[PDB]
Protein backbone atom coordinates (compact mmCIF):
# COMPACT_ATOMS: atom_id res chain seq x y z
CA UNK A 1 0.00 0.00 0.00
CA UNK A 2 1.72 3.24 -0.82
CA UNK A 3 -1.23 5.43 0.33
CA UNK A 4 -3.78 6.25 -2.59
CA UNK A 5 -5.64 4.39 -5.70
CA UNK A 6 -5.00 5.74 -8.84
CA UNK A 7 -9.01 6.65 -9.15
CA UNK A 8 -7.65 9.17 -6.85
CA UNK A 9 -5.33 10.99 -9.36
CA UNK A 10 -7.81 11.15 -11.99
CA UNK A 11 -8.99 14.81 -10.98
CA UNK A 12 -8.01 17.77 -8.71
CA UNK A 13 -11.20 17.49 -6.48
CA UNK A 14 -10.23 13.57 -5.58
CA UNK A 15 -6.18 14.75 -4.88
CA UNK A 16 -8.17 17.06 -2.41
CA UNK A 17 -9.96 14.68 -0.89
CA UNK A 18 -7.32 12.38 -0.85
CA UNK A 19 -5.17 14.98 0.64
CA UNK A 20 -7.98 15.40 3.30
CA UNK A 21 -7.99 11.77 4.29
CA UNK A 22 -4.18 11.49 4.51
CA UNK A 23 -4.59 14.35 7.15
CA UNK A 24 -6.62 12.52 9.15
CA UNK A 25 -4.80 9.68 9.00
CA UNK A 26 -2.28 11.35 10.46
CA UNK A 27 -3.91 13.60 12.97
CA UNK A 28 -2.25 17.13 10.67
CA UNK A 29 -3.76 20.22 12.05
CA UNK A 30 -2.37 22.98 9.97
CA UNK A 31 -1.58 26.67 11.78
CA UNK A 32 -4.19 28.27 9.06
CA UNK A 33 -5.64 27.63 5.63
CA UNK A 34 -3.43 29.34 3.94
CA UNK A 35 -0.71 26.69 5.24
CA UNK A 36 -3.43 24.08 3.96
CA UNK A 37 -3.50 25.50 0.53
CA UNK A 38 0.49 25.47 0.59
CA UNK A 39 0.99 21.52 2.00
CA UNK A 40 -1.97 20.08 -0.81
CA UNK A 41 1.00 21.49 -2.94
CA UNK A 42 3.59 20.16 -1.53
CA UNK A 43 1.64 17.22 -1.33
CA UNK A 44 0.54 16.53 -4.63
CA UNK A 45 4.07 17.07 -5.78
CA UNK A 46 5.29 14.24 -3.54
CA UNK A 47 2.44 11.98 -4.82
CA UNK A 48 3.41 12.90 -8.15
CA UNK A 49 7.18 11.73 -7.44
CA UNK A 50 5.90 8.89 -5.54
CA UNK A 51 3.31 7.35 -8.53
CA UNK A 52 6.46 7.95 -10.75
CA UNK A 53 9.41 6.03 -9.10
CA UNK A 54 7.19 3.28 -7.95
CA UNK A 55 6.53 2.65 -11.69
CA UNK A 56 10.09 1.12 -12.13
CA UNK A 57 11.34 -2.30 -10.75
CA UNK A 58 13.39 -0.95 -7.77
CA UNK A 59 13.58 -3.08 -4.37
CA UNK A 60 11.48 -0.99 -2.21
CA UNK A 61 9.06 1.67 -3.16
CA UNK A 62 7.51 5.18 -1.25
CA UNK A 63 4.46 6.02 -0.09
CA UNK A 64 2.11 8.56 1.20
CA UNK A 65 3.58 8.40 4.66
CA UNK A 66 4.21 10.66 7.13
CA UNK A 67 6.13 13.50 5.70
CA UNK A 68 4.29 13.24 2.61
CA UNK A 69 3.43 17.16 3.00
CA UNK A 70 6.85 18.30 3.54
CA UNK A 71 9.11 19.45 0.39
CA UNK A 72 12.74 17.72 1.01
CA UNK A 73 14.00 20.96 1.28
CA UNK A 74 12.13 21.28 4.57
CA UNK A 75 12.34 18.18 5.64
CA UNK A 76 16.09 18.06 5.20
CA UNK A 77 16.81 21.45 6.31
CA UNK A 78 17.69 20.34 9.73
CA UNK A 79 18.87 17.42 7.58
CA UNK A 80 16.82 14.35 9.73
CA UNK A 81 13.03 14.37 10.28
CA UNK A 82 10.73 14.80 12.69
CA UNK A 83 22.30 16.95 11.71
CA UNK A 84 20.61 15.08 13.91
CA UNK A 85 24.13 13.63 13.68
CA UNK A 86 27.82 15.71 13.80
CA UNK A 87 31.13 15.05 12.68
CA UNK A 88 32.37 -15.76 14.68
CA UNK A 89 29.50 -17.77 13.28
CA UNK A 90 26.00 -15.56 13.58
CA UNK A 91 22.50 -16.31 12.71
CA UNK A 92 20.83 -15.94 9.82
CA UNK A 93 18.49 -13.53 11.16
CA UNK A 94 17.99 -11.50 13.57
CA UNK A 95 15.35 -9.58 15.07
CA UNK A 96 15.37 -7.98 18.82
CA UNK A 97 11.99 -6.86 18.69
CA UNK A 98 11.30 -10.99 18.34
CA UNK A 99 13.13 -11.07 22.22
CA UNK A 100 11.05 -8.21 23.62
CA UNK A 101 14.35 -6.02 23.80
CA UNK A 102 12.95 -3.46 21.73
CA UNK A 103 10.64 -0.50 23.71
CA UNK A 104 7.68 0.92 21.07
CA UNK A 105 9.00 2.72 18.03
CA UNK A 106 9.33 6.33 19.44
CA UNK A 107 8.85 9.81 17.71
CA UNK A 108 11.83 12.78 18.31
CA UNK A 109 9.55 15.61 16.23
CA UNK A 110 11.19 18.71 14.95
CA UNK A 111 13.88 18.45 17.30
CA UNK A 112 17.26 17.30 15.82
CA UNK A 113 17.55 15.04 18.41
CA UNK A 114 18.25 11.39 16.78
CA UNK A 115 21.63 11.08 18.17
CA UNK A 116 19.52 10.88 21.70
CA UNK A 117 17.05 8.25 20.65
CA UNK A 118 19.40 5.80 19.10
CA UNK A 119 21.41 5.72 21.94
CA UNK A 120 18.67 5.14 24.28
CA UNK A 121 17.35 2.83 22.35
CA UNK A 122 20.26 0.50 22.36
CA UNK A 123 20.46 1.11 26.39
CA UNK A 124 17.38 -0.17 26.48
CA UNK A 125 17.80 -3.17 24.62
CA UNK A 126 21.24 -4.25 26.45
CA UNK A 127 19.25 -3.88 29.82
CA UNK A 128 16.78 -6.24 28.41
CA UNK A 129 19.15 -8.30 27.32
CA UNK A 130 21.38 -8.57 30.51
CA UNK A 131 18.46 -8.48 33.41
CA UNK A 132 14.93 -9.66 31.79
CA UNK A 133 13.47 -6.07 32.39
CA UNK A 134 12.37 -4.15 28.82
CA UNK A 135 12.23 -0.28 30.33
CA UNK A 136 11.99 3.31 28.44
CA UNK A 137 14.87 5.83 29.59
CA UNK A 138 14.69 9.56 28.79
CA UNK A 139 15.84 10.43 25.41
CA UNK A 140 15.14 14.34 26.83
CA UNK A 141 17.76 13.94 29.89
CA UNK A 142 20.35 12.99 27.41
CA UNK A 143 19.58 15.97 25.17
CA UNK A 144 19.27 18.32 27.93
CA UNK A 145 22.44 17.06 29.87
CA UNK A 146 25.23 15.60 27.19
CA UNK A 147 27.47 18.88 26.97
CA UNK A 148 29.35 16.97 23.75
CA UNK A 149 26.41 17.30 22.04
CA UNK A 150 24.34 20.75 20.84
CA UNK A 151 20.52 19.60 21.62
CA UNK A 152 17.90 20.03 19.23
CA UNK A 153 20.86 20.90 16.97
CA UNK A 154 22.33 17.45 16.47
CA UNK A 155 24.74 15.57 18.86
CA UNK A 156 26.95 12.34 19.31
CA UNK A 157 25.87 8.79 19.97
CA UNK A 158 29.40 8.44 21.65
CA UNK A 159 28.97 11.09 23.86
CA UNK A 160 25.43 9.74 25.12
CA UNK A 161 26.30 6.25 25.77
CA UNK A 162 29.39 7.40 27.61
CA UNK A 163 27.35 9.76 29.50
CA UNK A 164 25.32 6.84 30.79
CA UNK A 165 28.14 4.97 31.36
CA UNK A 166 29.89 7.29 33.74
CA UNK A 167 26.84 8.66 35.38
CA UNK A 168 23.69 7.11 34.34
CA UNK A 169 19.83 7.70 33.15
CA UNK A 170 16.41 8.12 34.77
CA UNK A 171 13.26 6.30 33.32
CA UNK A 172 11.29 7.71 30.51
CA UNK A 173 8.60 8.61 32.91
CA UNK A 174 10.85 10.13 35.26
CA UNK A 175 12.23 12.67 32.67
CA UNK A 176 9.81 12.68 29.63
CA UNK A 177 10.59 14.06 26.17
CA UNK A 178 9.65 17.85 25.04
CA UNK A 179 11.18 17.73 21.98
CA UNK A 180 12.89 21.00 22.68
CA UNK A 181 16.54 21.51 24.77
CA UNK A 182 15.83 22.97 28.56
CA UNK A 183 18.62 22.47 30.94
CA UNK A 184 19.87 19.81 32.61
CA UNK A 185 17.42 18.84 35.61
CA UNK A 186 19.47 14.99 36.19
CA UNK A 187 19.64 16.08 39.81
CA UNK A 188 16.44 16.88 40.75
CA UNK A 189 15.55 13.80 39.41
CA UNK A 190 17.02 11.68 42.38
CA UNK A 191 18.96 8.43 42.00
CA UNK A 192 19.53 6.98 38.61
CA UNK A 193 17.23 3.85 37.34
CA UNK A 194 19.75 2.19 35.23
CA UNK A 195 23.79 2.90 34.61
CA UNK A 196 26.20 0.99 31.75
CA UNK A 197 29.58 0.06 32.15
CA UNK A 198 31.16 1.01 28.98
CA UNK A 199 30.57 2.04 25.19
CA UNK A 200 32.80 -0.17 22.46
CA UNK A 201 32.85 1.24 19.13
CA UNK A 202 32.26 -1.23 16.26
CA UNK A 203 35.87 -1.32 13.48
CA UNK A 204 34.43 1.13 11.05
CA UNK A 205 33.57 0.64 7.25
CA UNK A 206 33.42 -2.90 8.06
CA UNK A 207 30.13 -5.03 7.40
CA UNK A 208 31.24 -8.31 8.87
CA UNK A 209 31.96 -6.74 11.89
CA UNK A 210 28.93 -4.55 12.45
CA UNK A 211 26.62 -7.84 11.89
CA UNK A 212 28.69 -9.34 14.71
CA UNK A 213 28.09 -6.76 17.07
CA UNK A 214 23.88 -6.71 16.52
CA UNK A 215 23.76 -10.75 16.87
CA UNK A 216 25.33 -9.94 20.46
CA UNK A 217 23.04 -6.54 21.15
CA UNK A 218 21.34 -3.31 19.00
CA UNK A 219 23.82 -1.34 17.78
CA UNK A 220 23.84 2.27 17.38
CA UNK A 221 24.64 3.55 13.75
CA UNK A 222 24.57 6.14 11.50
CA UNK A 223 23.22 7.09 8.00
CA UNK A 224 22.87 9.49 5.51
CA UNK A 225 18.50 10.32 5.68
CA UNK A 226 18.13 13.70 4.20
CA UNK A 227 17.15 11.91 0.44
CA UNK A 228 13.78 12.08 -0.94
CA UNK A 229 13.73 8.67 -1.44
CA UNK A 230 14.57 8.05 2.25
CA UNK A 231 11.83 10.80 3.36
CA UNK A 232 9.38 8.67 1.47
CA UNK A 233 10.07 5.61 1.95
CA UNK A 234 7.10 3.24 2.57
CA UNK A 235 8.40 -0.62 2.44
CA UNK A 236 11.05 -3.04 1.35
CA UNK A 237 14.50 -3.39 0.95
CA UNK A 238 15.80 0.15 0.50
CA UNK A 239 19.14 0.11 -2.16
CA UNK A 240 19.51 3.72 -2.70
CA UNK A 241 19.74 6.53 -3.64
CA UNK A 242 21.69 8.02 -0.69
CA UNK A 243 25.63 8.90 -0.31
CA UNK A 244 27.56 8.50 2.62
CA UNK A 245 27.43 12.24 4.53
CA UNK A 246 25.82 10.70 7.26
CA UNK A 247 23.64 12.72 8.62
CA UNK A 248 21.58 10.78 10.99
CA UNK A 249 22.11 8.43 13.95
CA UNK A 250 19.69 5.01 14.18
CA UNK A 251 19.62 1.75 15.84
CA UNK A 252 20.48 -1.66 13.91
CA UNK A 253 18.29 -4.31 15.72
CA UNK A 254 18.68 -7.16 13.40
CA UNK A 255 19.64 -8.40 10.11
CA UNK A 256 19.02 -10.80 7.27
CA UNK A 257 21.13 -12.18 4.39
CA UNK A 258 20.16 -9.08 2.28
CA UNK A 259 19.78 -6.27 4.68
CA UNK A 260 20.13 -4.57 8.05
CA UNK A 261 17.23 -4.09 9.79
CA UNK A 262 16.91 -0.28 11.12
CA UNK A 263 14.94 1.30 14.14
CA UNK A 264 13.86 4.90 13.27
CA UNK A 265 12.74 7.54 15.40
CA UNK A 266 9.94 9.35 13.06
CA UNK A 267 7.45 7.50 14.33
CA UNK A 268 5.29 4.64 13.06
CA UNK A 269 4.11 6.24 10.59
CA UNK A 270 6.84 6.60 8.33
CA UNK A 271 8.31 3.52 6.71
CA UNK A 272 8.06 -0.17 7.73
CA UNK A 273 5.80 0.48 11.17
CA UNK A 274 8.81 2.90 12.05
CA UNK A 275 11.51 0.71 10.57
CA UNK A 276 13.68 0.44 7.36
CA UNK A 277 15.43 -2.34 6.22
CA UNK A 278 18.88 -1.17 4.52
CA UNK A 279 20.43 -3.09 2.04
CA UNK A 280 23.34 -5.03 2.50
CA UNK A 281 26.22 -7.17 0.92
CA UNK A 282 27.33 -4.56 -1.79
CA UNK A 283 30.77 -4.94 -1.43
CA UNK A 284 30.67 -0.73 -0.39
CA UNK A 285 32.69 -0.45 2.51
CA UNK A 286 30.97 3.14 3.57
CA UNK A 287 27.44 0.75 3.78
CA UNK A 288 24.38 1.63 1.48
CA UNK A 289 23.71 5.55 3.11
CA UNK A 290 27.28 5.43 4.77
CA UNK A 291 25.64 2.97 7.31
CA UNK A 292 28.83 1.01 8.39
CA UNK A 293 30.62 4.85 9.05
CA UNK A 294 30.30 5.60 12.69
CA UNK A 295 28.48 2.37 15.62
CA UNK A 296 29.29 2.30 19.25
CA UNK A 297 26.84 0.36 21.38
CA UNK A 298 26.86 -0.03 25.55
CA UNK A 299 28.56 -2.14 27.73
CA UNK A 300 26.68 -3.94 30.78
CA UNK A 301 27.95 -6.52 32.72
CL1 LIG B 1 26.94 4.40 0.07
NA1 LIG C 1 24.56 4.60 -0.56
Given at each position: ????????????????????????????????????????????????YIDETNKKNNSYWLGLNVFADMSNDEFKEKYT????????????????????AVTPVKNQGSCGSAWAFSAVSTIESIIKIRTGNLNEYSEQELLDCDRRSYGCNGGYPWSALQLVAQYGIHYRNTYPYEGVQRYCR??????????????????????????????????????????????????????GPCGNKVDHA???????????????????????????????????????????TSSFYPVKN
Open positions: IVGYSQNDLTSTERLIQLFESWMLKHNKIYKNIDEKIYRFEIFKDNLKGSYTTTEVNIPEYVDWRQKGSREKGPYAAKTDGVRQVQPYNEGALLYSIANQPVSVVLEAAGKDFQLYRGGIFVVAAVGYGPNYILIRNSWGTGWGENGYIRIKRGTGNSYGVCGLY
